[PDB]
Amino acid sequence: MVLSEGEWQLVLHVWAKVEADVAGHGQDILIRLFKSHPETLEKFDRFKHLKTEAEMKASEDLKKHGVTILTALGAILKKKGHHEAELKPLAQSHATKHKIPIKYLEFISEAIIHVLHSRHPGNFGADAQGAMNKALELFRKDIAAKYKELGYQG
Template identity: 25%
Template sequence: MVLTDDDKSHVKHVWSVVLPHAGDIGADALTRMFAAHPTTKTYFPHFDLTPGSADIKAHGKKVAAAIGEAVAHIDNIAGALDKISTLHAQKIRVDPVNFPLLSHCFLVSIAAHHQEVLQASTLLSMDKFLGRVCAVLTSKYR
């Protein structure tokens, strides 16, 4: 998925709006993912998966930070997420199908909390961007 200059501009704009609340949106996305896709909970046996728990909030911040890194390095997402990609593929061994599930939940969380920023064009750009993030995160599985 090639991100156009317009896509990059839209993603950076959306992220500038989301950034002050990025950890909360990350936590909300995880909560939504666990509720909608219960099999994703298997990677978190040591977590308190209750919505709003300290574990969910802490991991939500990590998810948001990774997405923020990808935004900050939008021209080199693979380089920015290399360590995270390797960790998930080789150590944690997360089923790669889970990344698009979280990506979708992240978009839903943005829409739920900042619907004003997700117009048709920005939504498409964010979807392409998160698709690119998912492709990078699954690249180490091959």
């Protein structure tokens, strides 16, 4: 798929708001993911024990990782589709070391859209949401194709 420039603008205009507080957004997102789809919590041997949302909010580690996720995603979005290089190492560690099913990349895509909608209603109307959705679908389709090349499937 190809996003137009007007779609990329809508995605990079709400991402610039997310970058004013990356640690807060990365925390909200991960918690939204772990409450909605608790099975995803099992993939993190590092956070697995966290039992409540309050524990999650207090974990500094969890907040550090949220910043790692959003920094890597932001670097991919800012490429505006030319992200092949960035994708490579990310597809290799998530398909071979962490074993993360595409299904779980959809679940986090859903958590990102829920959090931007709650924090940025004015910059995240229907057109901007459609554009963000298109950009994450593009990210998931390219990762899925690398997963096949790398041998991960089902």
